[PDB]
Structure formats: C-alpha cells, structure tokens
Symmetry: C4
Subunit: 401 residues, 4 copies
C-alpha cells in the first residue's frame, strides 16, 4: 500500500501543476511566492522515474515517454527567465503526466467499480481541468483592465462553462478576430466533450438492468409462443408464477448453465458443498468409498416442482430417486386420502427404484416450490458398473426382493 | 392493498414537503397558515417508522437511515425560531424521504412496466422537483423588489427551465458574483440532468424492437449465405416466404428453443395441452397406459412444410409418423392423378411405418403451411423397449403383415 | 393496391387537416374559401369507417376510438358558429387520425425498411407537424399587430424551431406571463423531442455494422488467446488470412450454423441445390436409389483448406472422401516430385477409402482456398446399413480388393 | 500502392473543389488567378474514369453515376460565362465526388480501424466541409458592405459554428425573411448533424470494453447463484481468485470455446504448436506413427487447478493422464509427509493409468495455477482401437503387470 499512497501523492502533484501552470502564465505575479512547493513537485515527479523503473520497456518507450517529458523541469525556466508568450506555452509539458496518471487509474482502481463509470469519472475530471485551462486561455487574450484577478477569473470560468455545456447565454461574447477564432475552436471542443459525456452516460445506463431484462424478454417469448399454441389460462398462469419464483429466488439464472462456467475441481467442490447435507445417510450408499459418492454427486440434475404438482404417481414403474434441497413434500396414498409423511429439506424419496423396478407404492405431491435434485437409474447403473464391490452389495440388497 | 394506499399517502406527504420547504424558506410569510397540515405530515412521517419496522436490519441501518433522518421534525424548529439563512438549510432533511420513496417504487411498481421506463419517469419527476428547488434558490439570492410573489417565481422557474434544458435564451442572466457561481453550478447540474435524460431515452429506444430485429438479421444472414452459394431465386424465395410465415405466426421464435426454458413438469403439461387433440385415438396406442402416452409425447419433434412440399413419397421405405397440428394435407396416388383424402388438424398419417418397414403406399403433399409433429421409428422402438406389454401387442399387430 | 392508394389519400387528408386547423384558428379569414375541400375531407374521413370495418373488435374499441373521434365533423361547427377561443380548441379532434395513420404505416411499410429508421422518419414528420402547431399557438397569443400574416408566421416558426432544437438565440423571447408559461411548456416539449431524436439516431447507428463487428471481435478473441499460448507468427498469420478469406467471401458466417435455421425440407432442398453438381457421377453410388443420395447429402460436413495445406497424406490409413466445391487441388506423389492431376470444382478424391481401409496412395495439397465437403466412413457405414442392396453391391466392389 | 497514392491525390483534388467552389461563388474576384490549378483538377478528375474502369457495371451505373456527374467540367463554364446566381448553383456537381471518395475510404482504410471510428471521422470531416459551405451561403445573402473578405468570412464561420453546435449565442442573427428561412433550414441541419455525432460517439463508447464486461457479468452471475446456494466464503473466494487468474492471463476467454472457431486443419496445427513440447517423449507412445500422435492430441481437454487442489488422490482407481503446460506440481506420498518430486512444464503424471487400472500410488497437489491437459482412458481406448500395432504393443506393456 506504500505504492498505493505514492500514487495518490503523484496524482496530487499532477493536479497541482495542472491548476497552477496556466494560472501563472496569465498572472506573472505568482511563481515568486510558490517556487519552493513546485520545486518539491519537480523533485517528486523525478523521483517517480526510479519508483516505476524499479517496478520489475526501457527509456524512450512508446508508453513511458510522457513521464519523462513531464519529468524535466521545463518550468522553473520560462517563468524564471520570463520568456515571451509565443514560446512559453511549451512550459505545459508537465500536463502530460495526466496521461500516465489515467493509465495508472484505469488498472489500479479498475477492480471494484464498473469500468463505464470509472471512464465517466475520469472524463468529468478532465473536463473540469480543461475548463480551468480554457478559462485561463480566454482570460489571457482580453484587453487590459484594472479589475481584480478574482473577478475576471469568475467571468472567464462563467463563459467557458456556458460554452462547454452548449447553453450559450450570450452575455459574454467575442469582440476581436483572435477572440472569435478562440471561441470557434472551443465551441467545437465543447460540442465534442458534451457528446462524449452523453455517450458515456448512455453506455452506462444501457446496461444498468441486465438480469431483469433477460428474464423479462424470456417471459415475453414464452408467453407469446404459448398464446400462439392456444394454451389454457390456468397453465399459462402456472408458468408465469414459476418464472416469478425463479426471479425472486435466483434472479432468473438457470442452475445448469451457471454451474458450468467453473472448472471441474471447483465444480466438484461446489457440488459437495451443496449435496453435503444429504448424501451421507442414504441407507444403500452407506459404507461405500468416497469416490463412489463423488461420482454420484456430479450426475444429479436439478428440477423445480410448483405447488401441487405430481412428482411420483402410485402404480407407474418409475426409475428415479429425488433429493429434497429447498422445499417440502407430502407423501400420499394411491387413493390420495391418507398423508403418510411430510418430507422436507435433506430427506429423499424414490430410493427403492434404483434397486429394482417395482412399481411406485405411493404418490408424491409438492407443497411449495421444491427445488429438488434427481438421479436416474440408467445413470446410476452406468456409474455403478465401475465399482464391482458396491454393485455386488446392491445386487445382494436386490436379491431380497 | 392497505399498505399499497399508505405508500401513496407517504408519496403525497413527501411531495408536499419537497414543494413547501424551499418555497417557505424564500417566503417566511408562509408556515403560519400551513402549520397544522405539516404537523400532520410529520406525524405521518413518524408513523411510517413502525409500519415498516413491523414489516417482518434494525435502527441505524445503511438503507434505513434516510427514513429516520427525514422522520424527526427538524422543521417546525427553524421556521418557528426564525433561524438565519446560513444555518436553516438543514431544514431540508425531509427531502431525504425521496430516496426511500424511490426505493419503494423501484420494487413495488417494478412488475408491470419496463424498468427502463420506470427509471425515466422517476428521473423526470426528480428533475421537475429539483427545478422547483433551484427556482426557489435563484429567487432567494436576488435584490429585494416589490414585485408580487407569483411574478418573480414565474421568472425564476423560467430561468431555471431555460438553463436546465440547455437552451439558454439569455434574457435572464447573472449580475453578481454569487449569482454567477450559482449559475455555473446549476449549468453543470443541468448538463448532467439532460445527459441522463438523453441516455435513458436512448436506452429505452435501443431495445424497443427485439424480436423483429433478431428475425430481420437472421433472414439477412441466411440470404447472404445462399447468395454466396448461388442458389436459385425460386428456392431463395421459398425460404423468404417461409420466414414470412414464421414471423407472422409466432414472431420468429423457434419452437424447440422456446419450449426448453421450462422445467420438466411444466414442459410435460404444455406437451399434453398441445398434443391433447391427437394422441388419444391412434388405433395402435389405444388401451395403452397413460405413462406410454406421456413417454411418446415428449419425443415429438415439430417440422413445418410449405405449400406443395413432399412430406412422404410413394415407394420409399420411410420410418416416420406425422401428426397434423395447424395445417392441411392431401394424400395423392403414386402417379399423382387421384386424391385419396384431405387430412387436416388432429388427424395423422404414416401410422403403418412404426409397425413394419413396408414401403410407403401413397404420396403426401402439403396444401398450406402445415406445422406438424413427427415421431421416428428408432425413438419409438427405443421407448417401446421399456413397455413389454405394449411391445408384445405391437409385435402381434405386426405378425399380421 | 387499391387499398394501398386509399391509405395514401387518407394520409393526405389527415395532413391537410393537421396543417389547416390551427392556421384557421389563428386566422378566421380562412374557412370561407376552403370549406368545400374540407367537407370533401370530412366525407373521405367518414368513408374510411366502412372501408376498414369491412376489412375482415367492433365500434367503441380501444384501438379504433381515435378513428371515430376524428370521423365526426366537429369542425364545420366551431368555425361556422364562430365559437370563442376557450372552447374551440376541441375542434382539434381531427388530429387524432394521425395515430391511426401511424399504426397503419408501422405495419404496411414495415416490411422493406429497418424499423429503427421508419420510427425515426415518423418522429421527424410528427416534429415538423407539431412545430407548425406550436408556431400557430405562439402566434395566437401575441399582441395585435398590422403586420401581414406571412411575416408573423415566419417569426413564429423561427422562434419555435430555435426553441425545439435547443439552440435558443434569444432575439424572440416571452414578454408576458402567459407567454412565459407557454415558453416553459414547449421548452420542456422541445427537450423531450430532441432527446427522442438523439435516442433514435443512436439506436439506428449502434447496429449499423453487425457482421463486421462480430467478425472483428472473434478475430480479436482468437488472436489474444493464441498470443497467450505463444504460437508462431507464421501460423498466427495463416489464421489471420483464413479469417480474411472468410470475411471477403461469406461475411464471416459459419456454414454449419447458418444452414441450421431452416426446417428439414428447405434444408434438404438447399443441400440438393449445392451438391447437385457433384453427387450424380460418383462411380460407386451410380444406379442407387434417390433416397440413398438424399441420405448421403445431409451428412456432408464442410471444411476449408488454405493454400498449401495437406488434405491427404500418402501412407496414412484414412477413411474420408472429399468433394471439391469452390476451389482447386493438386494430387502429388509420395515423394512429392510428380503432379498426377489437378482436381477442381465438381470432382472428388479419396473415393477408395469408403470401400476398404487401404492406405492412401498419393498426397493431396490445396492450391487455393478449397471450400470442400467431406464424408466419413463411420457415417457412410451407419447410413449404408439401412440399404441392403447398395451395401451388398459395395461389398462386391470390395471383394475385388 | 501506386493506386493507394492516386486515391490520396483524388481526395486532395476533391477537397480542393469542395473548398474553392462556394468561396468562388461568393467572391467572383477569384477564378482568374486559380484557373490553371482547377483545369489540372478537372483533367485529374477525368483521368480517374479510365483508372477505375480498367479496375477489372458499365457507364450509367447506380454506383458510378456520381463520378461521371462530377467528371464533366460543369465549372469553367458558369464562372467563365459569369452566369447569374439563380442558375449557377449547378456548378456544385463537383462535390458529388465526395460520395465516391467516401465509398473508397469505407473499404480501403476499413481494415485496421474500428468501423464505428472511421464513420465518425468521415462524419466530422463532412461536418467541417459543410460548415464551410454553409458559411459561404450565409455570407452570400448579406447586405453589401465594404468590409474585407477575411473579416466577413470569419463572422460567417463563427455564426455557422455557433448554430451547428446548438450553442446559439445570439450576437449574429437573421434580419431579413430570406435570412430567417436560411437560418431555420440550417438550424434543422445542425440539430441533425449534432444528433448524428452524439449517436456515433455513443455507439463507439457502448462497446469500448467487451471482454471486461462479459467477464464481470459472468462473475456477478456466479456469485449471485452461489450466494443463493449458501456456499462458504472460503470456496466462494477460491472461485473469485480463479476468475481473477482467468482474467489476468487470457482475458477471461474459455479455451475450448475459442479454439473451436477454427477449421479442422488450423485447429490441428494449433494443437501441434501447443502440445509440441510434451508429446514426443512419453515412454509408451514412443515409436508410434505420427497419425497416432495427431489422433491423441485433438482429444486433450484442458483443466485449471488452483493452488493446493488435489489432482490425484492415492488409493483411488483413476483412469486419466495429465500433461503439465503452464504450471507446477508436487508429488506427495499417501501420508503426505514426503515430497517425491516437483513436476513442471512439459512433464506429465498418471501415465500408468492408461496401461491398467491399478490404484494410484501417490497423491498430487498443485502448487500454483497449473493450466494442464488431461486424457481419459475411455477416449484412449476408443482411439487406440484403430491402431492394432500400437494396441498390441500396449497390451504387451500391460502383460508385465
Ligand atoms: C456543488 C457545490 C459547489 C460549490 C463551489 C463553490 C466554490 C467556492 C467559490 C466561492 C463562492 C462565493 O460565494 O464567493 C464568490 C467569490 O468568488 C470570487 O470572486 C473568486 C473567483 C472565483 C473562483 C472560481 C469560482 C469557480 C466556481 C466553480 C463552481 C463549480 C465548480 C464545480 C463571490 O464572492 P461574494 O459574493 O461574497 O462577493 C461579495 C460581492 O462582491 C458580491 O456578492
Ligand atoms: C402540459 C400543460 C401544462 C400546463 C401548466 C399550466 C400551469 C398553470 C399556471 C397558470 C398559467 C396561467 O395562464 O396563468 C399565469 C399565472 O401564473 C402566475 O403568475 C403564478 C406563478 C406561476 C406559477 C408557476 C408556473 C409554472 C408553470 C410550469 C408549467 C410547466 C410545468 C410542467 C399567468 O397569469 P395571467 O396571464 O392570466 O396574468 C394576466 C396578465 O398579468 C398577463 O396575462
Ligand atoms: C431543404 C430546403 C427547404 C426549403 C424550404 C423553403 C420554403 C419556401 C419558403 C419561401 C422562402 C423564400 O425565399 O421566401 C420567403 C417568403 O416567406 C414568407 O414570407 C411566407 C411565410 C413563410 C412560410 C413558412 C416558411 C417556413 C420555412 C420552413 C423551411 C424549413 C422547413 C423544413 C421570403 O420572401 P422574400 O425574401 O422574397 O421577401 C422579400 C423581402 O421582403 C425580403 O427578402
Ligand atoms: C486546434 C487548433 C486550430 C487552429 C485553427 C487556426 C486557424 C488559423 C486562422 C488564423 C487565426 C489568427 O490568429 O488570425 C486571425 C486571422 O483570421 C482572418 O481574419 C482570416 C479569416 C479567417 C479564416 C477562417 C478562420 C476559421 C478558423 C477555424 C478554426 C477551427 C477550425 C477547425 C485573426 O487575425 P489577427 O487577430 O492577427 O488580426 C489583428 C487584429 O485585427 C485583431 O487581432
Ligand atoms: N410410509 C412412508 N413414509 C415415507 N415415505 C414413503 C412411505 N412409503 C413410501 N415412501 C416413499 O415413497 C416412494 C414411492 O415409491 P418408491 O418405490 O419410489 O419408494 C417410496 C419411498 O421412497
Ligand atoms: N386411402 C387413404 N386415405 C387416407 N390416408 C391414407 C390412404 N392410403 C394411405 N394413407 C396414409 O398414407 C400413408 C402412406 O404410406 P404409409 O405406409 O406411411 O401409411 C399410409 C397412411 O397413413
Ligand atoms: N493418378 C491419379 N489421378 C487423380 N487422382 C488420383 C490418382 N491417384 C490417386 N488419386 C486419388 O487420390 C486418392 C489418395 O488415395 P485414396 O486411396 O484416398 O484414393 C485416391 C484417389 O482418389
Ligand atoms: N517417485 C515419483 N516421482 C515422480 N512421479 C511419480 C513418482 N511416483 C509416482 N509418480 C507419478 O504419480 C502417479 C500417481 O499414480 P499413477 O499410477 O497415476 O502414476 C504415478 C506417476 O505418474
């Protein structure tokens, strides 16, 4: 962090020069009672050279020539020698340090803020600094007057702000050919700057809601298609409330498409974190090796059931086993008159299907949105074929009907 | 809804304060014949504290400190005691309730309107309210005059509107250093506000047509590729009219990609809704269990045939069976001189292919765009292998040639 | 088209009213030498009612009430009776026909133009028409003067155009409280209109190049990844020139992803159009049924070879057969000292691989970008298993070594 | 390049005409001491006709009529004959060459610059040129004055720049009906031009960061989903630092999705470039044919392991073999108390798994981010089935336990 405060000091010295140099060009009465601070400033700006050359691309580099062009005290010379106005503008080389400061900021602070906002903040800072420079430029090429320095600077800053925002009141206007040329030049500059601001704000806003518009558009697409297919309002309302649940819980993201941007080891660690509250107590995987567990966990597919949907129907063959994660379930009878149990988070049903293909013995209805994971029997057999010990033990559990 | 009218009352009291406080700061002649209504207002704004603390994150919360900062009657004190202008601006803490009102609106009404439009409406309301505040601020720092209150408020609102829209006529301009500083500040504010408005409008418009531009661009892509491949105008016109039919019926959405954003139970319910008018009367699935039906319905693939395309050619082996959904079909002979029948919505053809691989006995031509669903024979056998009873019955129907 | 000229006549009568009604409100000296044309206009606007009610949603419809609100001659009454200004503004109901005209245009002409440009054109037309209306409104509430009608209309249109574009010269300004309120209202309107124009232009431009930026970004992605992987400049230049060829020929579109947005019958017809110049003369598919041909054509995968790349290497086993489409090929010897032949568009090589897996007998080098299609041997066997006659004939051709 | 300098000469002559023609219409005192250069210019503009007709679509073409309309000396006639102002405006046909110049530029220079920036540069050039033309137009229709030509041109350019940027000071304003009509027309033109500039800048900025925002949004999506799934901060921090590594190394691009936009031969050449430092020294593929190597290289799947993750666990069966590319590895013992070796870039482990399925003999932990490639045993057997010699040799190496 001792570099991350020296960067702030460098920014402060750069903004000292970018506020003092033009204000001193217009007012030679300065630079006498400010010389020590700017000599300290020059020594600081030359002490940055070894503090970034020792930052583990040598001199005269396409990206490091601005730093050396701002490094040399090319001030302390024109003001000390009192060079005439036509040639003393080259004292402004110190302002080239702003480019290096901006490249620093666009990669140091560019971790915890939206880049389209960092760009806008940098642009606004540069606009304010350029407005100060333009105000000094306008105030330089005016007829001599005995008005104090503070008043005419206020008038100059007022004029440049009313020109750069493209408001243009018209109470301060050019009166001389050179003033007219200057005004044309910075009218073009102000139009460009304001266009840049509007473009940056439009780019910042055009992506301020992303998940919400993606979800909204997928819902519109689904509803248009089902309105074409002539589907009942009851089901076309069940689908709407399912999408409502999806948005309110996980911002509409699809589980299987999100958990696929991860590499295999992080994906496996996430899968263990999730199915760590279930798959240790299943009374047919008990005592199996950890690799069998790690093999049956990467092949669990999620599925969400709304309130009242049939998960399992009594009498049908069935082959799946379901693990409840974030919901609840009621086990009813074939005639649906008795409620055997209310399974909830952590528990599971359908366990007997993996052993043999006996028809289901009870019906299963969701009570709320369940958000549960299912395992097939084809997948279970496929990944059981590689573990002869557990496969033989399950075949034994099968031979008992 | 008794919360959804109290929110409206809270909005009304907040906008009462945000219109009365500055207008009373400029005009001390008020606050005498308005005190009861604003004391009712303060009691209402303090009765909001338990009506959202009992909303099932305690005091001094990063998102609930504005409410308590606007809650305390920090008005009723500066106006009653007639505090001087430099310090009485802290009476404006009541305006912080606007932030809580906006957070309320951006999630209560944020269900049935495009979020990019709700944001624009909130921004426009805030601009009007800030323009009132800025007009009062400008009207405060003017030389004393005997003009009535209504006239100078009209002039102040005129000036702030002609500054905030960046029009800037110039007939009302600063005449004092403090007025010039104020004008600079709100010129910057007006440029920012107008840039925000333009960005919001651009973001709202840049996605006003989505399905249409997606369809248009896929048609351009297809036509460019086939123009490269040197394909006849006849076929490159058949493709254009197919895309025309797709757009005019289902807005260009792909059937198999839309009906895939649904979970398995909702997808199965949609599939039953669609194929509920066909698969109950097929005279070889008759009497089969409901699970067999639910298994053959999830494996039907759609396909659209244009007017005059050959669906089935007499003599070829063939293995598929087609279900007509939203079109019509004519069954012709091998020599294509006799029209056996005109099948339409609900009916089906190719049924004998699933039984055995006898060559097709008649040709089939579309009459309009058909929009029909097909089932393979490999898929039919694959999902028939799991139902020995129906498989044996179909083998019996096969042994009769 | 006799409806598609009556729509133009309706547009002309609507724009006659939207230009005449305000200009007559300001100038009562009209409406005497213009009554017959507007009575014809009213009869035309009432003859539109049966010409769209007989357009194969009855009266008092949410989308057809503007037409009936503009239909009744609510003009011909205020001007004939000379109603006072406060109440005669309701004569403007005829302008509601503009909404129906716009809904007509946004679906009639909305086939052959970019919708983001049709929207902009409609917006610009509405802006010009509203500027005429606003000019008449401003010219109504002015002090009486003896200036001619043409001059004060020029001044009014000048003022409203310099206000709506947010330029605001300031040489024509309000001078009365009612003029100030009017100016505030249309300053807000002009800011909104100009923001709409800027948003529409930004949306129109932000998608003016699509294929080009997609291609450019995929090339940047590829080059960044290979620069990370430290790949030679020679190969990283071969890839660049391959992408150059892709862009210059088919605008960077991927063949297998474009020809997949088509249904199966159109895709098969396109495949026959493309492989119609090759697969009739292959001397082992000769005499096979048309269905075998239609089966081997849908399984041809494209592949592009740059200039000098090895397609087939002598000695390797190999299993594929390649069909030249849009390039050229030279067949060289194992020692690469003799050029046996120069195959070109239409011809094919590797034919003997499908029969048996004898090692390749000669090497094959591309001369230019080839753009050729390949067929496997696994796919060929898979789709040959369903044709016993052709399979037996090929086995016979195989038994001859 | 001798065409690529003649294009620059054509651009220079076109910009000579587009700066001289209006300035000569206003000032007839020119065209006497400039005739030779513009006669050279006309001969140059007529020498472009054969230098693009011989560019390997004949005369009177929809895209080449502007060139012939600018080709004929329709100047050198109105100025020589001194035609009156109403009809001499047709001398401006030379400016139509700008359209051909722009079509040239939008495909010659349109290779190494972002198209949205080339469009903006062309628009800005056209705006400056049109501002010169508009300044000349405004200066033509002014009352006669004895002011010098340079001064009134400065005033005219000042007025047109303050109108086109929508600043509108108001110190130069119309004073005549024709001046008012001209000012209205170019107020509309300036609003359109400035809207175009803002739209182009917004489009240029709205895609200035693409990889960064894609990466940022995928990280937000992942973190929101895992915050919903209630995953530990330790693992939800491991995932964040993995995404940090991905961004800092390869800009967040997915390896398997980037290296899939390439055709098969370029993909194979890239794969050899990458796995050229490993797969020549594996002591069981040694001596195998080059085709076996080229077959095992296209089936290597990448995977990234963070610092400390278990790649291989001692005791588990295991079937994979891993090739280290851009990281490091430490081989530890079953009790994890002894470090056998430190494998690094180029080396590989797990080689014995392909031979037989003996349990792993040591554990393997990453030391830094590894970025290594893995080969299965199912894939190895699948692609070994096609090489009987190498398969037999590996079976021999297997029969030695
Ligand atoms: C957001 C909030 C921002 C606040 C910025 C405030 C900046 C502080 C500047 C001080 C503002 C101030 O009130 O004092 C002025 C001094 O300015 C002067 O002359 C000194 C010269 C002015 C210095 C430059 C002013 C630029 C202000 C740029 C503001 C936007 C920047 C973002 C006027 O004196 P004062 O009325 O008592 O005279 C008495 C009699 O002559 C007439 O009143
Ligand atoms: C969209 C449609 C919007 C309509 C807003 C109308 C607001 C109603 C304001 C009333 C407008 C009005 O006609 O009355 C004015 C009163 O304003 C006054 O002085 C009282 C002070 C003005 C109050 C604030 C006016 C802001 C208007 C902001 C409008 C845009 C807001 C969006 C002028 O009196 P009046 O000519 O008879 O005098 C006679 C003689 O002295 C000169 O005519
Ligand atoms: C793109 C090209 C567009 C061209 C629009 C031209 C519109 C034609 C309008 C006619 C323009 C015209 O030259 O004639 C004017 C008549 O306007 C009048 O008074 C009649 C009233 C003016 C009618 C409304 C003018 C709106 C112009 C809106 C233009 C942009 C619209 C897009 C002035 O007369 P004139 O100098 O000889 O007097 C002699 C002495 O008194 C001073 O010169
Ligand atoms: C970015 C940087 C851009 C720089 C552009 C500079 C253009 C060079 C133009 C020359 C500018 C210049 O300083 O000379 C002017 C001559 O203009 C004249 O009259 C001749 C007529 C003016 C020629 C056209 C000027 C357009 C400038 C457009 C600039 C933006 C374009 C982008 C005034 O003379 P000057 O004060 O000594 O008189 C003495 C006494 O009468 C009052 O001072
Ligand atoms: N009495 C019960 N209490 C809780 N769960 C049950 C009960 N009876 C059956 N189940 C579960 O419901 C499932 C339905 O049939 P299965 O064969 O899939 O296996 C069954 C068990 O998992
Ligand atoms: N006379 C007929 N009327 C209606 N449909 C028929 C007739 N003859 C054949 N078909 C259908 O057309 C199909 C063509 O051959 P298939 O063997 O596929 O099965 C046939 C029936 O489904
Ligand atoms: N003399 C030749 N002229 C043209 N083509 C040839 C010649 N010899 C071999 N080929 C082709 O080159 C192929 C290389 O080996 P194949 O066995 O694939 O089949 C070969 C033929 O298709
Ligand atoms: N002493 C060692 N030095 C380096 N690598 C080893 C050593 N012992 C085992 N390995 C590697 O670690 C792997 C772990 O078990 P495998 O059977 O996969 O094959 C092993 C070798 O690839």
């Amino acid at each position: 962090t001792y570099t991350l405060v020296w960067k702030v000091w460098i920014l402060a010295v750069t903004l000292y020069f970018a506020i003092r140099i033009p204000l001193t060009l217009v007012f030679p009465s300065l630079f006498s009672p400010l010389l020590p601070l700017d000599i300290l400033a020059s020594l600081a700006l030359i002490a940055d050279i070894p503090l970034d050359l020792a930052f583990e691309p040598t001199l005269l580099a396409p990206s490091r020539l601005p730093d050396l062009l701002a490094a040399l005290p090319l001030d302390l010379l024109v003001f000390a020698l009192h060079l005439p106005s036509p040639l003393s503008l080259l004292s402004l080389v110190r302002l080239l340090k702003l480019i290096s400061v901006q490249r620093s900021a666009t990669r140091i602070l560019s971790y915890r803020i939206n880049p389209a906002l960092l760009r806008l903040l940098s642009l606004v800072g540069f606009i304010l600094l350029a407005a100060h420079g333009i105000a000094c430029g306008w105030m330089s090429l005016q007829p001599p007057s005995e008005n104090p320095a503070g008043t005419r600077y206020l008038s100059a800053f007022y004029w440049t702000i009313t020109t750069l925002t493209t408001i243009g009141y018209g109470d301060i206007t050019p009166s001389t050919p050179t003033q007219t040329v200057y005004t044309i030049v910075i009218e073009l500059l102000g139009a460009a700057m304001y266009g840049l601001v509007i473009g940056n704000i439009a780019s910042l806003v055009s992506k301020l809601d992303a998940a919400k518009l993606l979800h909204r558009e997928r819902v519109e697409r689904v509803t248009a298609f089902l309105s074409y297919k002539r589907i009942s309002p009851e089901l076309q309302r069940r689908i709407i409330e399912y999408f409502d649940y999806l948005w309110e819980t996980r911002r509409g993201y699809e589980e299987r498409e999100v958990l696929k941007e991860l590499p295999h080891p992080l994906r496996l660690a996430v899968a263990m974190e999730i199915h760590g509250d279930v798959i240790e107590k299943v009374p047919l995987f008990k005592g199996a090796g950890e690799e069998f567990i790690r093999d049956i966990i990467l092949h669990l597919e999620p599925v969400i059931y709304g309130p009242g949907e049939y998960i399992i129907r009594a009498g049908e063959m069935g082959s799946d086993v379901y693990f409840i994660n974030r919901g609840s379930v009621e086990v009813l009878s074939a005639d649906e008159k008795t409620r055997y149990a209310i399974l909830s988070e952590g528990q599971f049903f359908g366990e007997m299907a993996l052993i043999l293909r006996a028809p289901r013995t009870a019906t299963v209805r969701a009570r709320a949105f369940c958000d549960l994971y299912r395992l097939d029997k084809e997948t279970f057999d496929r990944i059981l074929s590689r573990y002869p010990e557990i496969a033989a033990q399950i075949q034994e559990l099968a031979v008992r009907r």
